[PDB]
Design an enzyme around this catalytic site. Structure first.
Site, PDB file in Angstrom:
ATOM      1  N   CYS A  84       0.833  -1.193   0.000  1.00  0.00           N
ATOM      2  CA  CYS A  84       0.000   0.000   0.000  1.00  0.00           C
ATOM      3  C   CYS A  84       0.868   1.243   0.000  1.00  0.00           C
ATOM      4  O   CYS A  84       1.622   1.471   0.951  1.00  0.00           O
ATOM      5  CB  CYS A  84      -0.942   0.022   1.211  1.00  0.00           C
ATOM      6  SG  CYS A  84      -1.933   1.516   1.314  1.00  0.00           S
ATOM      7  N   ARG A 127      -0.058   4.491   3.047  1.00  0.00           N
ATOM      8  CA  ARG A 127      -0.031   4.248   4.487  1.00  0.00           C
ATOM      9  C   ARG A 127       0.369   5.459   5.314  1.00  0.00           C
ATOM     10  O   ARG A 127       0.445   5.330   6.538  1.00  0.00           O
ATOM     11  CB  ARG A 127       0.926   3.100   4.811  1.00  0.00           C
ATOM     12  CG  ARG A 127       0.533   1.782   4.201  1.00  0.00           C
ATOM     13  CD  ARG A 127       1.528   0.718   4.572  1.00  0.00           C
ATOM     14  NE  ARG A 127       2.592   0.610   3.581  1.00  0.00           N
ATOM     15  CZ  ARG A 127       3.724  -0.050   3.775  1.00  0.00           C
ATOM     16  NH1 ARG A 127       3.952  -0.644   4.933  1.00  0.00           N
ATOM     17  NH2 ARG A 127       4.642  -0.107   2.808  1.00  0.00           N
ATOM     18  N   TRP A 153      -9.271   6.355  -0.454  1.00  0.00           N
ATOM     19  CA  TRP A 153      -9.562   7.114  -1.659  1.00  0.00           C
ATOM     20  C   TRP A 153      -8.598   6.663  -2.737  1.00  0.00           C
ATOM     21  O   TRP A 153      -7.596   6.000  -2.457  1.00  0.00           O
ATOM     22  CB  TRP A 153      -9.462   8.630  -1.442  1.00  0.00           C
ATOM     23  CG  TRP A 153      -8.188   9.085  -0.806  1.00  0.00           C
ATOM     24  CD1 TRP A 153      -6.978   9.329  -1.430  1.00  0.00           C
ATOM     25  CD2 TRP A 153      -7.987   9.372   0.581  1.00  0.00           C
ATOM     26  NE1 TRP A 153      -6.051   9.747  -0.501  1.00  0.00           N
ATOM     27  CE2 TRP A 153      -6.648   9.783   0.737  1.00  0.00           C
ATOM     28  CE3 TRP A 153      -8.813   9.324   1.705  1.00  0.00           C
ATOM     29  CZ2 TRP A 153      -6.119  10.135   1.981  1.00  0.00           C
ATOM     30  CZ3 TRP A 153      -8.288   9.673   2.932  1.00  0.00           C
ATOM     31  CH2 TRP A 153      -6.957  10.074   3.061  1.00  0.00           C
ATOM     32  N   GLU A 197      -4.889   4.116 -10.526  1.00  0.00           N
ATOM     33  CA  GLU A 197      -5.680   2.896 -10.380  1.00  0.00           C
ATOM     34  C   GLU A 197      -6.852   2.883 -11.355  1.00  0.00           C
ATOM     35  O   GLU A 197      -7.177   1.837 -11.928  1.00  0.00           O
ATOM     36  CB  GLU A 197      -6.197   2.749  -8.948  1.00  0.00           C
ATOM     37  CG  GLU A 197      -5.148   2.719  -7.862  1.00  0.00           C
ATOM     38  CD  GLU A 197      -5.777   2.648  -6.470  1.00  0.00           C
ATOM     39  OE1 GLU A 197      -6.210   1.540  -6.057  1.00  0.00           O
ATOM     40  OE2 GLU A 197      -5.856   3.707  -5.798  1.00  0.00           O
TER      41      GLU A 197
HETATM   42  C1  HEM Z   1      -6.199   6.335   2.109  1.00  0.00           C
HETATM   43  C2  HEM Z   1      -6.037   6.245   0.783  1.00  0.00           C
HETATM   44  C3  HEM Z   1      -5.361   4.996   0.173  1.00  0.00           C
HETATM   45  C4  HEM Z   1      -4.641   5.017  -0.956  1.00  0.00           C
HETATM   46  C5  HEM Z   1      -4.334   6.270  -1.815  1.00  0.00           C
HETATM   47  C6  HEM Z   1      -4.161   3.664  -1.199  1.00  0.00           C
HETATM   48  C7  HEM Z   1      -3.378   3.252  -2.257  1.00  0.00           C
HETATM   49  C8  HEM Z   1      -3.194   1.930  -2.591  1.00  0.00           C
HETATM   50  C9  HEM Z   1      -2.830   1.385  -3.885  1.00  0.00           C
HETATM   51  C10 HEM Z   1      -2.560   2.178  -5.187  1.00  0.00           C
HETATM   52  C11 HEM Z   1      -2.747   0.061  -3.755  1.00  0.00           C
HETATM   53  C12 HEM Z   1      -2.416  -0.933  -4.887  1.00  0.00           C
HETATM   54  C13 HEM Z   1      -3.790  -1.487  -5.250  1.00  0.00           C
HETATM   55  C14 HEM Z   1      -3.789  -2.066  -6.629  1.00  0.00           C
HETATM   56  O1  HEM Z   1      -2.931  -1.667  -7.452  1.00  0.00           O
HETATM   57  O2  HEM Z   1      -4.665  -2.928  -6.888  1.00  0.00           O
HETATM   58  C15 HEM Z   1      -3.073  -0.301  -2.383  1.00  0.00           C
HETATM   59  C16 HEM Z   1      -3.105  -1.577  -1.867  1.00  0.00           C
HETATM   60  C17 HEM Z   1      -3.527  -1.947  -0.593  1.00  0.00           C
HETATM   61  N1  HEM Z   1      -4.039  -1.108   0.388  1.00  0.00           N
HETATM   62 FE1  HEM Z   1      -3.975   0.865   0.303  1.00  0.00          FE
HETATM   63  N2  HEM Z   1      -4.652   2.844  -0.171  1.00  0.00           N
HETATM   64  C18 HEM Z   1      -5.405   3.632   0.683  1.00  0.00           C
HETATM   65  C19 HEM Z   1      -6.076   3.199   1.822  1.00  0.00           C
HETATM   66  C20 HEM Z   1      -6.001   1.968   2.420  1.00  0.00           C
HETATM   67  C21 HEM Z   1      -6.667   1.549   3.648  1.00  0.00           C
HETATM   68  C22 HEM Z   1      -7.562   2.510   4.456  1.00  0.00           C
HETATM   69  C23 HEM Z   1      -6.323   0.261   3.890  1.00  0.00           C
HETATM   70  C24 HEM Z   1      -6.685  -0.715   5.015  1.00  0.00           C
HETATM   71  C25 HEM Z   1      -7.453  -0.362   6.064  1.00  0.00           C
HETATM   72  C26 HEM Z   1      -5.448  -0.164   2.806  1.00  0.00           C
HETATM   73  C27 HEM Z   1      -4.875  -1.412   2.677  1.00  0.00           C
HETATM   74  C28 HEM Z   1      -4.330  -1.879   1.500  1.00  0.00           C
HETATM   75  C29 HEM Z   1      -3.995  -3.252   1.191  1.00  0.00           C
HETATM   76  C30 HEM Z   1      -4.144  -4.464   2.130  1.00  0.00           C
HETATM   77  C31 HEM Z   1      -3.514  -3.287  -0.057  1.00  0.00           C
HETATM   78  C32 HEM Z   1      -3.026  -4.551  -0.795  1.00  0.00           C
HETATM   79  C33 HEM Z   1      -4.152  -4.988  -1.736  1.00  0.00           C
HETATM   80  C34 HEM Z   1      -3.732  -6.258  -2.431  1.00  0.00           C
HETATM   81  O3  HEM Z   1      -2.620  -6.777  -2.116  1.00  0.00           O
HETATM   82  O4  HEM Z   1      -4.497  -6.763  -3.303  1.00  0.00           O
HETATM   83  N3  HEM Z   1      -5.289   0.896   1.942  1.00  0.00           N
HETATM   84  N4  HEM Z   1      -3.338   0.875  -1.702  1.00  0.00           N
HETATM   85  C1  K8F Z   2      -8.593   0.888   0.410  1.00  0.00           C
HETATM   86  C2  K8F Z   2      -7.995   1.012  -0.977  1.00  0.00           C
HETATM   87  C3  K8F Z   2      -7.640   2.252  -1.499  1.00  0.00           C
HETATM   88  C4  K8F Z   2      -7.104   2.319  -2.789  1.00  0.00           C
HETATM   89  N1  K8F Z   2      -6.747   3.510  -3.326  1.00  0.00           N
HETATM   90  N2  K8F Z   2      -6.926   1.192  -3.508  1.00  0.00           N
HETATM   91  C5  K8F Z   2      -7.251  -0.026  -3.019  1.00  0.00           C
HETATM   92  C6  K8F Z   2      -7.021  -1.274  -3.844  1.00  0.00           C
HETATM   93  C7  K8F Z   2      -8.219  -1.569  -4.742  1.00  0.00           C
HETATM   94  C8  K8F Z   2      -8.330  -3.059  -5.070  1.00  0.00           C
HETATM   95  N3  K8F Z   2      -7.046  -3.658  -5.456  1.00  0.00           N
HETATM   96  C9  K8F Z   2      -7.264  -4.673  -6.501  1.00  0.00           C
HETATM   97  C10 K8F Z   2      -6.764  -5.734  -5.539  1.00  0.00           C
HETATM   98  F1  K8F Z   2      -7.672  -6.637  -5.226  1.00  0.00           F
HETATM   99  F2  K8F Z   2      -5.621  -6.268  -5.929  1.00  0.00           F
HETATM  100  C11 K8F Z   2      -6.578  -4.663  -4.483  1.00  0.00           C
HETATM  101  C12 K8F Z   2      -7.775  -0.134  -1.737  1.00  0.00           C
END
Ligand code: HEM
Ligand code: K8F
Ligand code: HEM
Ligand code: H4B
Ligand code: H4B
Ligand code: K8F
Ligand code: ZN
Lengths: 411, 411
Positions: B109, B112, B281, B286
């Protein structure tokens, strides 16, 4: 023990068993992955024969003469020479095999579909820096081929003791100079600012401009290195113009045609070749994205955005992205209009997927470093973004080595 | 034992000792690196107390009350409940800590830097799919906040036996439908084509168009899942227009504001929460790069290039790259002109470097997955491209889990 790699754009799966032959360590452990670390890290006679044997076994098992009489005699022959001399010498055929497979095994290289089309120049009879210059000039001329670039490597004598090393001190045969200014900023290429100053230290007369081709610093048999200027007719250069923006010529950019890495170490059967300059042709992004738009390289996003009429106040106008595409359309277009070989990152990465399929079938795998294979722009619109890749270390190989000015015992 | 990660754009070095606390395995070994593998891979009472103890030790060692009387009693209290019930229940404070640190530890992520600004909704009193729908609707409403998006997670009862699992079957709370055609091609989102057909299987009435918001499929205490439609006033959507090209409105694209992942598993002190939808958000890429321009997603590079007047015959005209920048300027511009929260990949990746510095100082490290942190366009013009990153697995964590329709014992 028979691992699977998936492509998530095509759902195509391939099975890797080549990784079983792998020998060296990667840096990663069961509990830490180091795949984004850039540079993660004398030889005795005991160590040498397993390495020679391992190498000779795969060379003969590749000309369909595994373990035959011709093999076992060469196996005996090398053992005896490692007894006699505590080292050994490669046949010309073994040198060519070793070199082609060092490139084949280079997991960070997206261009390996050409690995068997490699021209090997045997410079193991070289004794002086002047001979090195001569060999290198013939390498440049041959690989350039008037813009119809041809892949090549020149191999200087192998390390013996350690204090008698052949080294090319330049990191690449053709690079532009880098001069810091009294007002702090930099003219030319900031990457080479220390190397540009080493040349002036040993006696170079700098024409303090932008794209000043550096001279060669060539060290022979451990002796202190000597300066030589590549005859300018042998340094082919492409002036960069755009096929829309006529102000682009006024930017006054150009680049050299020949990417030729000269600071790495070729390891073949446990022998170490400390000077082995090797060259191919450019993928456009290496120039247009990294060379031109890296913050600590030429850093031209500033000026290209200006003349394009761009919203530079806000980060989220993507002015940086927009000027970056135009710059790489210009690098490409210029090289092709001059009949100078260049590949775009779409063609190169498609060819590498095709290469991966060939490797998994007739070899059982292909070591590949995703961090380096994926191009530095438009990553996910190229097929390598979606391809899982196993990284592992096969030999023969190209290895990094310390810069020679940190390790040499000068006089 | 105290590893260094370097940034090669700034020369800044940081020392990682947090990786020592790491427990789980990465997939890599000493001789193979798996950092580009996408998904690399009941609970007994013995295993549970070390996991509870480990977790409780860091929770109390974070409210500055390590090992005190209040700690040791809670340590004793949980042990006794793991004896009595062969499981245990988290305090509300422990649940909020665990959730915030699952996000903090999420190495994939880039967002974070906000990890401590997380709103935790405790749905552990829920018993039916209707209650799940109600909790989820309040989550959507709260996190959306009229476009001033707020990060949130809703936590449903933990797994007990394994056959009584709460699951949200959608991979995200808000996703568009995907319909294959009789002529083979696809309307809507191809990713969700099977899920779109599961909904029709259980009784959904599809309005077979493009951006049809899917219904929720909610499974409660292992019972077969049930369909519910999110009231459309709660699904905030951004119509995508460009700030130059007025034909861009005619493309007729739009996207939902709220990224809300619902198919993952939250692990806290060895307890498993199989339904824990969490939302933040969007980073613009994405939508504009992966959602819109992935070959097996909406695949709009074709049409955007057309209307831009582009050389589509040749691969090396970079028409794909050029239309890709425009598409992401349009996603960004539309979200901001509607006061819907969105971050560009330059701001998000700069914030993550800043986040990494905070983590290495007041925590001794930051697990980070380069393959996923680097944005899918313009990789090297963002500072995360140049930053070495150690990946390792810390707990509490978000983990992947099988799709529930492959594992459920239906009736
Ligand atoms: C606050 C704004 C946030 C932004 C801008 C953000 C951004 C991102 C992005 C770009 C990814 C890659 C997802 C993809 O390419 O499919 C990601 C993955 C992830 N985010 Fe964040 N995120 C946010 C909030 C959060 C929150 C609130 C949580 C958990 C409470 C979280 C947990 C995760 C997890 C677990 C992944 C891994 C998903 C996977 O491995 O499939 N994110 N995030
Ligand atoms: C909370 C959150 C914020 C964000 N900005 N983006 C994501 C990821 C969206 C879904 N991703 C495709 C997957 F399943 F690999 C995880 C999650
Ligand atoms: C034929 C055309 C070639 C193309 C298009 C190509 C492409 C590339 C690219 C883009 C890189 C990444 C370099 C960087 O980003 O700095 C690379 C790395 C590399 N290439 Fe190739 N290459 C070619 C030929 C060769 C040849 C002929 C050899 C060896 C004989 C070779 C060996 C290597 C090695 C060892 C690396 C790793 C460099 C490092 O780790 O610093 N390449 N190649
Ligand atoms: C931190 C990271 O390892 C470093 O920036 C790498 C990333 N990937 C790369 N990939 C290529 N082809 N060339 C590079 O110089 C780098 N640099
Ligand atoms: C093969 C590779 O692991 C796969 O395509 C990954 C690459 N990096 C990614 N990075 C992000 N943020 N999201 C992704 O879906 C992926 N996909
Ligand atoms: C033969 C060759 C072809 C090509 N197209 N590109 C390269 C890489 C150029 C230099 N790279 C910077 C580094 F030192 F990291 C390696 C080499
Ligand atoms: Zn690894």
């Amino acid at each position: 023990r028979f691992l699977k790699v998936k492509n998530w754009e095509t759902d195509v799966v391939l099975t890797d068993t080549l990784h079983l032959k792998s020998t060296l360590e990667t840096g990663c452990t069961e509990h830490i992955c180091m795949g984004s670390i850039m540079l993660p890290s004398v030889a005795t006679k005991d160590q040498l024969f397993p390495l020679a044997k391992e190498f000779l076994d795969q060379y003969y098992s590749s000309i369909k003469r595994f373990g035959s009489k011709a093999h076992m005699d060469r196996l005996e022959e090398v053992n005896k020479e490692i007894e006699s001399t505590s080292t050994y010498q490669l046949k010309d055929t073994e040198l060519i095999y070793g070199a082609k497979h060092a490139w084949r095994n280079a997991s960070r290289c997206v261009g390996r579909i050409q690995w068997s089309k490699l021209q090997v120049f045997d410079a193991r009879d070289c004794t002086t820096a002047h001979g090195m210059f001569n060999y290198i000039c013939n390498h440049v001329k041959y690989a350039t081929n008037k813009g119809n670039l041809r892949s090549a490597i020149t191999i200087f004598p192998q390390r013996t003791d350690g204090k008698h090393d052949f080294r090319v001190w330049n990191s690449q045969l053709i690079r532009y100079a880098g001069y810091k200014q009294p007002d702090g900023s930099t003219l030319g290429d900031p990457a080479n600012v220390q190397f540009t100053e080493i040349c002036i230290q040993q006696g170079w007369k700098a024409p303090r401009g932008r794209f000043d081709v550096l001279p060669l610093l060539l060290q022979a048999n451990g002796n202190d290195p000597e300066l030589f200027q590549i005859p300018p007719e042998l340094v082919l250069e492409v002036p960069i113009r755009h096929p829309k923006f006529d102000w682009f010529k006024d930017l006054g950019l150009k680049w050299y045609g020949l990417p030729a890495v000269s600071n790495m170490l070729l390891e073949i059967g446990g022998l170490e070749f400390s000077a082995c300059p090797f060259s191919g042709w450019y993928m456009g992004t290496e120039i247009g994205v990294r060379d031109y738009c890296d913050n600590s390289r030429y850093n031209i996003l500033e000026e290209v955005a200006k003349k394009m009429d761009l919203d530079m106040r806000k980060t989220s106008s993507l002015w940086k992205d927009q000027a970056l595409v135009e710059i790489n359309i210009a690098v490409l277009y210029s090289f092709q209009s001059d009949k100078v070989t260049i590949v775009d990152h779409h063609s190169a990465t498609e060819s590498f997927i095709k290469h991966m399929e060939n490797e998994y079938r007739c070899r059982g795998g292909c070591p590949a470093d995703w961090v380096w294979i994926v191009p530095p722009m438009s990553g996910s619109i190229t097929p390598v973004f979606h391809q899982e890749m196993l990284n592992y270390r096969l030999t023969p190989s190209f290895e990094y080595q310390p810069d020679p000015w940190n390790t040499h015992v000068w006089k």
